[PDB]
Symmetry: D2
Subunit: 199 residues, 4 copies
């Protein structure tokens, strides 16, 4: 992709936001990977929308890309696990443990064991290391603080956290400039689909 084409994506991101095509905005952010929307990410973490959180992240990094990315996915999936335990859904917890968390076992065998053993407690706060889990809301906020620091320090997000400053409706402005150009060819002085003409 050209630098031109990349900039055009940013102009479109701005346009879509101004037109309040909100889901389209975040899909384009994700598929192009040119811009990671922190506020959007924070929103989804607070709402516990873990599926969308990972889907969004997937446009920017894989779990094993580097150590920051690994800890990011580990923290998210671990919170997902603990929340399952908290609602007494041990069936879901084990599912999460095997499908989402097992990839981390290689990197730290004994931590995975420690986390596995939480399954068998009446309340996993009986483990002193997990006695710090307060409620869902507070534990998400605490974790989010850590997630932000990991993302901001993650080299794969290096130039993707600040939106280019531009004047409002920059795309619309360029379009109007093209219309003026189309007219600056016409003697004797419609649509965007085909050029404007005069006799």
């Amino acid at each position: 992709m050209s630098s031109l084409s990349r900039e055009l994506v940013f102009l479109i991101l701005q346009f879509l936001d101004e037109e309040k095509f909100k889901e389209t905005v975040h899909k384009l952010e994700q598929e192009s990977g040119f811009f990671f929307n922190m506020k959007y990410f924070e929103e989804k973490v607070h709402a516990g929308e873990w599926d969308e959180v990972e889907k969004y992240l997937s446009g920017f990094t894989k779990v094993d890309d580097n150590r920051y990315s690994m800890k990011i996915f580990f923290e998210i999936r671990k919170q997902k696990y603990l929340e399952a335990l908290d609602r007494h859904d041990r069936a879901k917890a084990v599912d999460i443990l095997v499908k989402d968390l097992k990839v981390f076992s290689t990197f730290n065998e004994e931590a995975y064991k420690e986390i596995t053993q939480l399954l068998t407690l009446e309340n996993f706060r009986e483990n002193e290391q997990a006695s710090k889990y307060g409620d869902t809301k507070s534990a998400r906020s605490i974790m989010l603080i850590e997630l932000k620091k990991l993302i901001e320090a993650n080299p794969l997000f290096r130039e993707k956290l600040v939106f280019p400053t531009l004047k409002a409706s920059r795309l619309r402005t360029l379009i109007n400039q093209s219309a003026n150009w189309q007219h600056q060819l016409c003697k004797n002085p419609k649509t965007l689909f085909t050029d404007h003409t005069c006799t």
Copy 2:
């Protein structure tokens, strides 16, 4: 929204497709509601991606908007129900029946009863009216044929089924026209974010 702004969405739809931002394309189709992609819809129906099918439809119509829309959602949810029965998941079938299909009971009480009673059969092909359900693949294709006819006849889709014919990369062309205009102001004759200048 202006006719200008609407046309700009179409230019963006073309650009996104050319850049192979496929999910963004269909999200913009859905959120703007300006264009319904039949081929995309066919693909998702054949794949049995019922959640995405309804989500996509939701940008164009509600279940109770008119009779065509009602039959469209009824046919989709009924196929979803029958497929649940076919894999012997009666728990899921009842869920579908109560959550997705019950809204249709008012409009036809006895058909809903008929469909409900399929739950109790060893094989719902024991009902002669449903003896026509062959396998999943063939039943999806048959239904799709009907879905297309309902959509094409649905007044809410009237001008949304044919993409405007335009030359490739129309957005990119307008952008280049703006660049030429920015230069047609410069004595003595960079970026898209701010205007190009010469001394």
Copy 3:
């Protein structure tokens, strides 16, 4: 089985009751089929122990033995079904409907349909015929009244509802009589396993 052997079972039923071998009592009642314990049956119905209720009944009658027996099992399984609905366990309800209640469909097609359709209600008291279901406790008591009348009128229970009047510990008394007989052979005048002897 002889009339002797049958009477011996009754003597054993009395002994087991006196020794408070309560589960053994009801197992012997069931396996021999000589006596149906109404009070025990009432207890299990009030407690909603449907599995044991049917197991106990199974020693005395099959579901299709006659019309009384059929209505007895129908009423029990229908209550089991309604209770599942009441606790919002539609998965269990459908299971009951297909496994336990379907055998009754042949005998009354439209009643089974009526009962099936209760699945789809938010509250099955929306059906006027089932608007009479109050709470679990009261509905069990009402049904029990009907179950008793069906059992008492059921020809297969004809001579099995009243325990033979006998003096307490009749078995123990006969045993002591045998011991006296064993001694009424001994010059010159231990265990039950072998005869008592004197030199």
Copy 4:
């Protein structure tokens, strides 16, 4: 209970067996606790009827009565757990782990952890200590061999493993002796419920 009354139970156990009241036999064995039927226990272990196995055992010992009893229940519940894993029912396995196996954690913390961690394997034979689990049939037979040795060495089963040798139908014989005694009072020389008389 007298030694008389205890012997009478054995006479009844014999009678019930001779009359093929099989479930009553094992219920009386269990409730009286006077005799533990090894062959019956073997049968139920081979059939994997774990609920009935524990119910039967419950008449003779509690899990924490002594070390033999503890190992007996541990081995049974562990096999139940492994079988759940084998059929890929991790939901059931966790249930067993928390409800049935947790009581053993106090006595051996690290073995319980080891067993817990089997949940997360694709195949729990990946653990070298559990690489010995062959198939269900063979693992039940192996375990049964150990269960027998534990039961035979368990002081609570000391005099409960061998049935008293007696002649067939000993109860029936004593009954006939009582009938003869009832007649050895009659000038001038029916039922078991009341004494036999002549004018």
